[PDB]
Amino acid sequence: PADQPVHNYMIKRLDRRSLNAAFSIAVEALGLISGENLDGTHISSAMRL
Amino acid sequence: CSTLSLVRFLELGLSVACVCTKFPELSYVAEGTIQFEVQQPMIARDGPH
């Protein structure tokens, strides 16, 4: 007699992980970037760059 | 109730002693020294120095 074409089956599980990193900003160099108080010459200065 | 009579510094008298000027980025640039000398006068004494 002939043979029937078998086929398989499997169930795989997702194994979960996570990686994380971080940095930090100084309080001194904080107000130099965001704050819109710097009017005329402190927007294009060397310290802000 | 009672109010809080505010007082301005520039409208005081002591303001004559000091020149006040706002320096926004100082706390950042305060990491190093500023270090400016001033002067010293000198008489022209006779005889070769």
Alpha carbon of residue A8 to chain centroid: 40
Secondary structure in 3-state letters for chain B: CCCCCCCCCCCCCHHHCCCCCCCCCHHHHCCCCCCCCCCCCCCCCCCCC
Q: How far is CA B35 from the centre of its chain?
A: 14
Contact A25, B6 (CB under 8 A): no
Pairwise CB contact (< 8 Å): B25 & A47 = yes
Query: Are the C-beta atoms of A42 and B24 separated by less than 8 Å?
Result: yes
Residue count (chain A): 49
Are B25 and A46 contacting, i.e. CB atoms less than 8 angstroms apart? no
Residues 6+ apart with CB under 8 A from A5: none
The residue of chain B nearest to residue A39, with distances taken between CA atoms, is B24
Cα B25 from Cα A31, distance rounded (Å): 8
CA B19 to chain centre: 5
Q: Which residues of B touch A40 (CB under 8 A)?
A: none
Nearest alpha carbon to residue A48 among A32, A24, A27, A30: A32
In the numeric block, the tokens 């997702």 are attached to A14
CB < 8 Å to B28, chain A: 28-29, 32, 47
Determine whether the interchain pair A42/B25 forms a contact, defined as Cβ–Cβ distance below 8 Å: yes
- Distance, C-alpha B44 to centroid of its chain: 31
